[PDB]
């Protein structure tokens, strides 16, 4: 669909309210502590919207939302959006200085926070002159007491479809950049990918390990399913415990499962993976980083369920290149999504020849107009009708897009560019490797060479044979210049809360260690 198909004045609360009153009694969200129907969610959201008015919240103002994946997260979100205020979904695993930057940068007058993050804000309270009211979920306004006297009716704000309704802070190399999205972006992404590509329907039930502050989870596990009347499952617990994730799948029986390759690998690493009932699943989705072909087969062979890998970014809200239930090429990002126009260019802007590595330029109506409080980086990223994602890609002879890696993660060995994704995808083929990361590192002649940081399967330790096996595997599958000069075994890798690997930290630690 197009933006022109939408009414000129649109509010993203319609994502929820397009289901009323027909699906008023259908359970909309499933949480271990709570289950709500579409009517109950709408009622509580209207109470939130009314309660925010009592705190003086107005159209165009940012409201802080820092809590676990829960019913209170959703009702707060739609309460803010319906009011015409700007919802700020904040990362749950940050530091107090990181929270201080965010809240000051968006001038949040009101913060909705869970009690377990309360002291993390309490120590930065003085440095937030605009923050007046802190509502606590779990000296302050408690969530339930705060929405109790408020009526369950509310009129949606007369928001333009291009007006900002949300602000997502994407972690940088930094710090984080504020990414504002308009009301129009929500039904657009829900239609362009959620329906047209993934094939979400009313009978479906979504469950994403990705959190609601991550737009991968925001769309896939809330905006997209509710757009078609489907239900969603919210997991408030720590994502690191893969066993509890599989049990949630067994208990609540979702039909769609979202995760990152690092999450799929962690699940398959479990010795008792098959002991969980995953039969309700009809489709799985992977994103955040490129899903290795070895992981796609390992999951397909253990579950029978296809995984849909697709690349998205917070600047575009969601996926712009994806695979399809009828068309999957394991290891690739699939085909261009209809409505999104792609382009691969060199480092000077010229369209590369077919098959060669180029920079990704995205043409989208769901893309943000600019960053929040980053003038320089906005003009570097948002190039008119084209969006620079900072990714290197190349196209198959069959038209399939393969992620070479982040432009920063690319390493140059002997003048030739080496893709970390390809090398990592080869390493993970070995059954002893759970996951890995490949960076560039000077070789005491200061010639950059590939170094592989490898996490082994649980309880497995390196051996003289294992190194040899991995070495011989890289000789058979990759060209000599792409082979890892060093192989270092680790028990953990620097990760973001969005299921990414912070290779810039490995690149920092390796450069530091090389100088010793």
Helix (H) or strand (E) holding 232: strand 231-233
Q: Which two tokens stand for residue 484?
A: 């890892």
Binding segment toward ligand 3UK, per CB under 6 A, in 52-60, 350-358, 385-393, 433-441: 385-393
Which among 252, 300, 245 has a CA at the least distance from the CA of 280? 252
Quote the least distance from Cβ 190 to ligand 3UK, whole Å.
12
Closest CB to ligand 3UK among 17 and 391? 391
CB nearer ligand 3UK, residue 80 or residue 313: 313
Residue nearest to ligand 3UK (CB): 312
Which position among 52, 57, 313, 357 is part of the footprint of ligand 3UK (CB under 6 A)?
A: 313
Q: Pick one of 84, 187, 194, 310: the residue that binds ligand 3UK (CB under 6 A).
A: 310
Residue 38 or 400 with smaller CB distance to ligand 3UK: 400
Residues pairing with 441 in the sheet: 449
Query: What DSSP line would sit under 404-440, residue for residue?
Result: EEETTT-EEETTEEE-HHHHHHHHTTSTTEEEEEEEE
The H-or-E segment that residue 49 falls in is helix 38-54
Binding to ligand 3UK by residue 259, rule CB under 6 A? no
Among 42, 170, 323, 364, binds ligand 3UK (CB under 6 A): 170
When asked if residue 423 is in the footprint of ligand 3UK (CB under 6 A), the reply is no
Q: How far is the CB of 126 from ligand 3UK (least distance, A)?
A: 31
Determine how many CB atoms are found less than 10 A away from the CB of residue 374.
Answer: 17
Site string for ligand 3UK, 285-304 (x = CB under 6 A): --xxxx--------------
The piece of 262-270, 345-353, 389-397, 423-431 that touches ligand 3UK (CB under 6 A) is 389-397
Using alpha carbons, list the distances in angstroms from residue 290 to 81, 287, 309, 311, 330: 32, 7, 8, 8, 10
* 406 in contact with ligand 3UK (CB under 6 A): yes
3-state secondary structure (DSSP) of residue 477:
helix
DSSP secondary structure of 74-98: HHHHHHHHHHT-EEEE--TT--HHH
Q: Which is nearer to ligand 3UK, 460 or 496 (CB)?
A: 496
**Site for ligand 3UK contains 319 (CB under 6 A):** yes
Contact region with ligand 3UK (CB under 6 A), list: 2-10, 41-49, 307-315, 443-451: 307-315
Number of residues that bind ligand 3UK (CB under 6 A): 22
Torsion of CA 482, 483, 486, 487, to 10 degrees: 120
CA distance 103 to 99: 6
Q: How far is the CB of 189 from ligand 3UK (least distance, A)?
A: 9
The interface with ligand 3UK within residues 208-237 (CB under 6 A) comprises 215-216
What is the rounded CA–CA span in Å between residue 115 and residue 406?
A: 37
Strands 358-363 and 341-345, how do they pair?
antiparallel
312 is a site residue for ligand 3UK (CB under 6 A): yes
The residue range among 78-86, 248-256, 282-290, 450-458 that interacts with ligand 3UK, by the rule CB under 6 A, is 282-290
Selected from 98, 306, 391, 435, the binder of ligand 3UK by CB under 6 A is 391
Strand order in the sheet with 177-182: 141-142, 133-137, 110-114, 62-66, 86-89, 164-170, 177-182
| Mutual angle of helices 293-303 and 261-268, in 10-degree steps | 50
Nearer to ligand 3UK, 106 or 147 (CB): 106
Q: Which is nearer to ligand 3UK, 42 or 218 (CB)?
A: 218
> Alpha-carbon distance 83 to 285, whole Å?
32
Pairwise CA distance, residues 455 & 471, whole Å: 15
Nearer to ligand 3UK, 146 or 214 (CB): 214
d(CA 125, CA 119) in angstroms, rounded, equals 10
Window 443 to 502, contacts with ligand 3UK (CB under 6 A): 498
Give the number of other Cβ atoms within 10 Å of residue 104's Cβ. 15
Q: Is there a cis peptide before residue 434, judged by omega within 30 degrees of 0? A: no
Question: Contact with ligand 3UK (CB under 6 A): which of 72, 204, 309, 422?
Answer: 309
Is residue 381 within the footprint of ligand 3UK (CB under 6 A)?
Answer: no
Report the nearest approach of ligand 3UK to the CB of residue 331 (Å): 10
314 binds ligand 3UK (CB under 6 A): yes
**Contact stretch for ligand 3UK (CB under 6 A) within 180-188, 198-206, 284-292, 445-453:** 284-292
Burial call 336-346: b when 16+ CB within 10 Å, e when fewer: bbebbebbbee
Stretch that binds ligand 3UK, among 118-126, 149-157, 370-378, 387-395 (CB under 6 A): 387-395
Contact footprint for ligand 3UK (CB under 6 A): 170, 215-216, 287-290, 309-314, 318-319, 333, 389-391, 403, 406, 498
């Amino acid at each position: 669909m197009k933006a022109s198909d939408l009414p000129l004045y649109y509010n993203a609360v319609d994502i929820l309210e397009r289901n009323l009153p027909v699906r008023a009694n259908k359970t909309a969200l499933f949480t271990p502590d709570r289950e709500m129907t579409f009517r109950q969610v709408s009622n509580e959201a209207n109470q939130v919207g009314n309660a925010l008015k009592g705190l003086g919240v107005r159209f165009g103002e940012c409201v802080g939302l820092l809590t676990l994946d829960s019913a209170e997260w959703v009702t707060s979100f739609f309460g803010i959006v319906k009011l015409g205020a700007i919802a700020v979904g904040i990362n749950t695993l940050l530091k107090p200085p990181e929270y201080e930057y965010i809240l000051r940068d968006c001038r949040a007058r009101v913060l909705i926070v869970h009690q377990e993050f309360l002291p993390l804000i309490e120590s930065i309270r003085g440095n937030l002159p605009m923050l007046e009211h802190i509502v606590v979920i779990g000296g302050y306004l408690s969530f339930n007491d705060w929405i109790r006297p408020q009526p369950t009716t509310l009129e949606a704000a007369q928001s333009h479809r291009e007006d900002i309704c949300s602000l997502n802070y994407s972690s940088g190399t930094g710090g984080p950049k504020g990414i504002p999205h308009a009301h129009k972006d929500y039904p657009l992404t829900a239609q362009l990918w959620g329906v047209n590509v993934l094939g979400l329907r009313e009978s479906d039930r979504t469950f994403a390990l990705a959190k609601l502050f991550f737009t991968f989870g925001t769309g896939g596990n809330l905006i997209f399913p509710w757009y078609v009347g489907a239900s969603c499952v919210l997991f408030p617990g720590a994502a690191r415990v893969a066993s509890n994730v599989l049990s949630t799948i067994s208990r609540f029986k979702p039909t769609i499962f979202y995760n990152a390759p690092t999450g799929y690998a962690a699940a398959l690493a479990l010795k008792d993976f098959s002991q969980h009932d995953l039969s309700s699943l009809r489709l799985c989705v992977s994103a955040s980083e490129a899903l290795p072909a070895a992981l796609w087969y390992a999951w397909k062979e253990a579950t029978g369920v296809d995984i849909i890998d697709g690349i998205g970014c917070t600047e575009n809200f969601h996926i712009f290149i994806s695979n399809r239930p009828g068309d999957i090429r394991p290891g690739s990002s699939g085909k261009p999504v209809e409505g999104y126009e792609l382009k691969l260019v060199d480092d000077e802007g010229k369209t590369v020849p077919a098959g060669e590595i180029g920079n990704v330029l995205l043409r989208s109506e769901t893309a943000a107009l600019s960053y929040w409080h980053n003038f320089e980086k906005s003009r570097q990223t948002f190039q008119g009708e084209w969006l620079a994602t900072g990714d290197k890609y190349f196209v198959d002879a069959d038209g399939y897009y393969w992620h070479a890696g982040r432009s920063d993660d690319m390493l140059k060995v002997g003048g030739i560019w080496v893709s970390p994704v390809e090398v990592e995808s080869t390493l993970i083929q070995h059954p002893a490797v759970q996951e890995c990361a490949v960076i560039g590192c000077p070789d005491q002649s200061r010639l950059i060479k590939p170094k592989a940081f490898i996490i082994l399967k649980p309880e497995q330790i390196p051996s003289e044979a294992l190194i040899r096996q991995i070495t011989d595997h890289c000789t058979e599958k990759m060209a000599a210049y792409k082979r890892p000069r060093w192989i270092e075994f680790v028990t953990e890798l620097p990760k973001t809360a969005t299921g990414k690997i912070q290779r810039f930290k490995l690149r920092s630690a390796a450069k530091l260690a090389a100088a010793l």
